Amino acid sequence: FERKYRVPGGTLVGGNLFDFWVGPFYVGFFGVATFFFAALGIILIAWSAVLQGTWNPQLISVYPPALEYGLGGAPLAKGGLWQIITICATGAFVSWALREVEICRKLGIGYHIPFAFAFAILAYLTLVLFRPVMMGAWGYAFPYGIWTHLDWVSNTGYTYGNFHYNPAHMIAISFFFTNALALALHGALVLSAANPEKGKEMRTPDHEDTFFRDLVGYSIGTLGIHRLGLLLSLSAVFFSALCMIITGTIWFDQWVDWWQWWVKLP
Amino acid sequence: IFSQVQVRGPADLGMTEDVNLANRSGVGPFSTLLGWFGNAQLGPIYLGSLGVLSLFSGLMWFFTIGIWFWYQAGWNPAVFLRDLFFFSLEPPAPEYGLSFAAPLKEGGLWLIASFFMFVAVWSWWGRTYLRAQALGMGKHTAWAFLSAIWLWMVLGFIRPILMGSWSEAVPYGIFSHLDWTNNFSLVHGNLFYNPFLGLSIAFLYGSALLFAMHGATILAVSRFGGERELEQIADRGTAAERAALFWRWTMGFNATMEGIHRWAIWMAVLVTLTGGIGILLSGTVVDNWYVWGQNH
Amino acid sequence: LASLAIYSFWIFLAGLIYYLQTENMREGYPLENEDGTPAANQGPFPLPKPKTFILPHGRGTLTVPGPESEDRPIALARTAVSEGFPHAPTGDPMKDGVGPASWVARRDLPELDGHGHNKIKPMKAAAGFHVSAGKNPIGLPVRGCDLEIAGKVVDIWVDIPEQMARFLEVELKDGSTRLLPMQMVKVQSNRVHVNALSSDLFAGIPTIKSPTEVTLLEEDKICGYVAGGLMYAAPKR
Numbered sequence: 001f002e003r004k005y006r007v008p009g010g011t012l013v014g015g016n017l018f019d020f021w022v023g024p025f026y027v028g029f030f031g032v033a034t035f036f037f038a039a040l041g042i043i044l045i046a047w048s049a050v051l052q053g054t055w056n057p058q059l060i061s062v063y064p065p066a067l068e069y070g071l072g073g074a075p076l077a078k079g080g081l082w083q084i085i086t087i088c089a090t091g092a093f094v095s096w097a098l099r100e101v102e103i104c105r106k107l108g109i110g111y112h113i114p115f116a117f118a119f120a121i122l123a124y125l126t127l128v129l130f131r132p133v134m135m136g137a138w139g140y141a142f143p144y145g146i147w148t149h150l151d152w153v154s155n156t157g158y159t160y161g162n163f164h165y166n167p168a169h170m171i172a173i174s175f176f177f178t179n180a181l182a183l184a185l186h187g188a189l190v191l192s193a194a195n196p197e198k199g200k201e202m203r204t205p206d207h208e209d210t211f212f213r214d215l216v217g218y219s220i221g222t223l224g225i226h227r228l229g230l231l232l233s234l235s236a237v238f239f240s241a242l243c244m245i246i247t248g249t250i251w252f253d254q255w256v257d258w259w260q261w262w263v264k265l266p
Numbered sequence: 267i268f269s270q271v272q273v274r275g276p277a278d279l280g281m282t283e284d285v286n287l288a289n290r291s292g293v294g295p296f297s298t299l300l301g302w303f304g305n306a307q308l309g310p311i312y313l314g315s316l317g318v319l320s321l322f323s324g325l326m327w328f329f330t331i332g333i334w335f336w337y338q339a340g341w342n343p344a345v346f347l348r349d350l351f352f353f354s355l356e357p358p359a360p361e362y363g364l365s366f367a368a369p370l371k372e373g374g375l376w377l378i379a380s381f382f383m384f385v386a387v388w389s390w391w392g393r394t395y396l397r398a399q400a401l402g403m404g405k406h407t408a409w410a411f412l413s414a415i416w417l418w419m420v421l422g423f424i425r426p427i428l429m430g431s432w433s434e435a436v437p438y439g440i441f442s443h444l445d446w447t448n449n450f451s452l453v454h455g456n457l458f459y460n461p462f463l464g465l466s467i468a469f470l471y472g473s474a475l476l477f478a479m480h481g482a483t484i485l486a487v488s489r490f491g492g493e494r495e496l497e498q499i500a501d502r503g504t505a506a507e508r509a510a511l512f513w514r515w516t517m518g519f520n521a522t523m524e525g526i527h528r529w530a531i532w533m534a535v536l537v538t539l540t541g542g543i544g545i546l547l548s549g550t551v552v553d554n555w556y557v558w559g560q561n562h
Numbered sequence: 563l564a565s566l567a568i569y570s571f572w573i574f575l576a577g578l579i580y581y582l583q584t585e586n587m588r589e590g591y592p593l594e595n596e597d598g599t600p601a602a603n604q605g606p607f608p609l610p611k612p613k614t615f616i617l618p619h620g621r622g623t624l625t626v627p628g629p630e631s632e633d634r635p636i637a638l639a640r641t642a643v644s645e646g647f648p649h650a651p652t653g654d655p656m657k658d659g660v661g662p663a664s665w666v667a668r669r670d671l672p673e674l675d676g677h678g679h680n681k682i683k684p685m686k687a688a689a690g691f692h693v694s695a696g697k698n699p700i701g702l703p704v705r706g707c708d709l710e711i712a713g714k715v716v717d718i719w720v721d722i723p724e725q726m727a728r729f730l731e732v733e734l735k736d737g738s739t740r741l742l743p744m745q746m747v748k749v750q751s752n753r754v755h756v757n758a759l760s761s762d763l764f765a766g767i768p769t770i771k772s773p774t775e776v777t778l779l780e781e782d783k784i785c786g787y788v789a790g791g792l793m794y795a796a797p798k799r
């Protein structure tokens with residue numbers, strides 16, 4: 001197949017100019033922008049490895065400009081290189097989304113995947129652009145390091161006691177847990193059907209729908225469960241981004257003390 | 267997206283198999299709510315014996331916990347609704363062994379309630395095998411549900427017995443389990459260096475990556491009947507065809523309308539599989555993961 | 563154990579990933595990719611095995627990997643020279659069904675639900691089937707992206723199993739009826755707006771053989787024609 005689809009077209013920005021395929025990969029204007037951005041951030045990280053004397057990935061880390069710098073600038077080595085790498089990361093993410101937007105047009109397909117990806121981008125920019133700007137110092141953001149970001153995770157979690165208690169976080173988790181169940185169930189359903197009990201003829205959506213009514217007593221649509229996947233996951237990361245944008249900006253306290261609101265009047 | 271027009275006709279039953287117990291309710295369609303997103307037909311359900319056995323023991327477990335919660339608030343409105351989260355059904359905790367049966371408020375409560383939760387879940391497994399067999403489907407749903415059962419079984423039955431004490435099990439309480447999970451991190455030398463928890467998080471994130479991706483591609487290939495997955499697997503056409511060409515042209519490789527579901531079952535079951543493995547070790551073999559890391 | 567177990571688990575993954583998963587995706591997608599050397603861009607391994615699907619109620623055995631090619635002609639002259647470029651269309655891509663207009667020759671049979679009967683047939687032929695919420699599309703003007711009316715909605719064609727409006731039957735001004743995918747129209751209260759297509763044409767939509775059933779072949783041809791209009795209709799963007 002493929003070949004009949006490779007027709008000249010689509011392309012938001014970049015005219016005819018960039019409409020070609022490096023093998024499987026469509027290029028396009030935002031394709032070169034993704035390349036350009038990933039090259040820049042890779043150079044600057046390579047550079048922060050050298051400036052600390054390690055090339056080992058368990059140890060290479062890039063941390064934000066410390067709290068006194070505010071939302072100002074910093075020296076590359078005392079913060080500024082996390083700042084430049086962030087600009088290349090946001091630039092390279094937004095190009096990739098708008099790369100998808102262009103492949104979509106050419107495939108005569110729907111906009112849903114870029115729209116979904118924009119949510120992972122929103123979560124990222126919560127932690128790195130919005131919650132720090134809100135809180136006045138770029139240093140509240142996380143370090144770009146395989147182990148050191150989990151160090152940041154545990155410290156900010158624990159700065160508020162047991163961060164399970166953060167309500168918007170509790171429900172974000174609730175979607176993460178439901179969405180995983182929804183994936184295991186959905187994939188397993190179609191393969192219950194396409195690959196029936198050995199020498200049986202393939203099953204039908206009619207069989208799928210009937211299986212879930214016998215277990216549960218309802219069966220959302222086939223269309224319906226793909227509407228469900230998209231929503232459980234984009235809610236999990238929406239509520240996640242909320243959870244980490246209220247903490248620090250409006251709740252400055254040990255999260256256990258929230259719930260006492262309920263605990264008193266009778 | 268949402269339906270624009272809803273269309274109804276009579277009720278459906280595409281063979282609810284043996285002994286045709288599966289007709290409790292027959293119907294109850296929800297339009298304005300369930301039908302704008304998904305299907306409207308409520309029911310029919312099957313209920314045959316194991317289904318009664320799960321609901322009986324499930325309810326029983328749930329009710330047992332409830333009588334002890336009321337005992338914690340004595341008996342009250344006000345207070346009960348106030349402290350619902352803060353009540354608990356901690357094990358024999360009183361941590362003095364596996365010791366077959368502790369006094370009612372000291373261990374009885376929990377072992378008794380755990381018996382019903384053990385039966386409820388296992389019979390419901392049984393159900394998912396049977397309900398599948400009968401429609402000639404094959405085990406997949408009760409392939410997947412076993413890694414869920416694995417994490418459940420390691421957190422309550424198998425690690426407390428691998429530790430020689432029921433005290434190492436999870437309490438039945440809202441806030442209690444949020445805390446048990448935190449303390450288990452603390453007393454196992456910061457669980458983030460537990461190599462399995464790192465894979466579990468990679469897969470739990472990976473699942474919200476993959477259903478978001480999958481969901482979005484079928485909904486984008488909706489207008490060529492892409493949601494008809496099972497058909498496109500039997501006779502492929504445009505929607506299957508350019509759904510995957512999107513990913514080949516973006517990230518470099520792709521999937522078959524069948525095979526992406528082969529990715530997705532696993533991309534979800536590896537969450538409790540790896541995770542379960544991870545907890546089985548955390549106590550039983552590795553006392554402290556920070557050290558474990560360091561010592562290589 | 564532990565360090566033994568984590569090593570073993572990373573072995574397992576290497577197993578899982580290619581030799582079930584990506585092997586089983588090679589089964590069709592794109593099936594030993596040749597327009598030159600059939601695997602070549604990177605080291606694969608390998609092309610999975612045959613698996614046969616016996617198809618339900620009626621006749622069929624699908625053995626995949628599929629030894630198959632569509633000869634049935636792709637009207638595309640290649641812009642060449644730096645060899646990885648856009649293949650241009652020789653004539654009108656839309657009628658030629660190429661690019662965003664591409665159909666696939668699927669089976670020219672209707673898909674029959676669980677008990678051998680047409681999945682989609684019109685609401686005229688559906689036993690007590692009628693619109694239970696939302697604007698009733700029947701009888702509305704159908705207006706294309708150039709704001710001009712090209713017919714009227716006459717019927718809804720419904721998927722019975724998963725009860726849903728899949729198509730609108732639109733009678734074009736001259737009693738010719740076209741089938742149109744529900745996922746491509748905007749049912750408002752005063753018009754039904756088809757954004758993908760021009761009014762003055764609409765006409766070009768592939769026609770059904772029976773008026774009461776549509777075939778998989780035909781569905782793909784209709785939907786493909788519609789969607790291609792989004793690129794190929796200059797009156798809209």
Ligand code: BCL
Nearest residue numbers: 120121123124153154156157163164172173240241243244
């Ligand atoms: C350890 C201390 C605290 C705690 C502290 C925190 C803190 C602190 C934070 C969280 C956050 C989260 N916590 Mg917590 N949390 C705790 C315990 C838990 C428990 C548990 C079982 O008890 C659970 C289930 C969770 C669950 C969660 C998630 C709901 C949430 C993660 C959001 C997310 O996925 O971001 C979305 C994902 C992204 C941002 C990724 C974006 C990716 C971008 C777009 C692209 C990358 C491109 C890549 C580089 C390209 C490479 C290309 C190559 C080709 C591959 N926490 C304990 C109590 N938790 C985070 C949150 O709320 O989220 C904002 C957060 O900041």
Ligand SMILES: CC[C@H]1c2cc3[nH]c4c(c3C)C(=O)[C@H](C(=O)OC)c4c3nc(cc4[nH]c(cc(n2)[C@@H]1C)c(C(C)=O)c4C)[C@@H](C)[C@@H]3CCC(=O)OC/C=C(\C)CCC[C@@H](C)CCC[C@@H](C)CCCC(C)C
Nearest residue numbers: 177180181184320321324387390410411414534535537538
């Ligand atoms: C990777 C494994 C993932 C997974 C998979 C999974 N779960 C599964 C399956 C699979 C593959 C099933 O086939 C099975 C199922 O039937 O799904 C619908 C199931 C299931 N996973 C469930 C839950 C669940 N799975 C979880 C997680 C996961 N499941 C993982 C994410 C979680 C967590 C902890 O987040 C939960 C809470 C069950 C809903 C369901 C079946 C378990 C079972 O055996 O249930 C029997 C229970 C009873 C008979 C007692 C019921 C008592 C309650 C009705 C009391 C009142 C509750 C209250 C909140 C009010 C009522 C709510 C509404 C009904 C109004």
Ligand SMILES: CC[C@H]1c2cc3[nH]c4c(c3C)C(=O)[C@H](C(=O)OC)c4c3nc(cc4[nH]c(cc(n2)[C@@H]1C)c(C(C)=O)c4C)[C@@H](C)[C@@H]3CCC(=O)OC/C=C(\C)CCC[C@H](C)CCC[C@H](C)CCCC(C)C
Nearest residue numbers: 038041089092093096116117120144145149471474475478
């Ligand atoms: C609903 C949101 C969920 C989601 C969705 C999602 N992700 C997506 C999509 C969607 C819909 C895509 O279309 C896109 C894709 O193409 O998938 C293959 C993608 C994608 N999601 C990815 C990852 C990812 N998504 C995540 C999460 C989520 N993605 C949510 C769960 C996470 C985590 C940790 O949870 C990760 C790691 C990528 C595999 C992929 C493509 C992203 C992309 O932009 O790729 C371009 C690649 C580059 C530009 C090279 C990077 C160069 C940079 C300069 C490096 C910068 C370093 C960085 C700032 C810090 C690194 C530090 C960490 C190690 C701590």
Ligand SMILES: CC[C@H]1c2cc3[nH]c4c(c3C)C(=O)[C@H](C(=O)OC)c4c3nc(cc4[nH]c(cc(n2)[C@@H]1C)c(C(C)=O)c4C)[C@@H](C)[C@@H]3CCC(=O)OC/C=C(\C)CCC[C@H](C)CCC[C@H](C)CCCC(C)C
Nearest residue numbers: 414415417418447448450451463466467470541542544545
């Ligand atoms: C502060 C505590 C630290 C912590 C602890 C922790 N995490 C844990 C555990 C613990 C102790 C686990 O046991 C669990 C795990 O498996 O460990 C690897 C897990 C885990 N931590 C996770 C994530 C996670 N932890 C994080 C952090 C941390 N985890 C902290 C460092 C983070 C962060 C900060 O980013 C993330 C994203 C998951 C990967 C994993 C949990 C995997 C999961 O989603 O599975 C849930 C599924 C179950 C619990 C199985 C239940 C199945 C039964 C069959 C259901 C029976 C249902 C019942 C009958 C009721 C039904 C009701 C209905 C009918 C309505």
Ligand SMILES: [Fe+3]
Nearest residue numbers: 186190480495
């Ligand atoms: Fe699917």
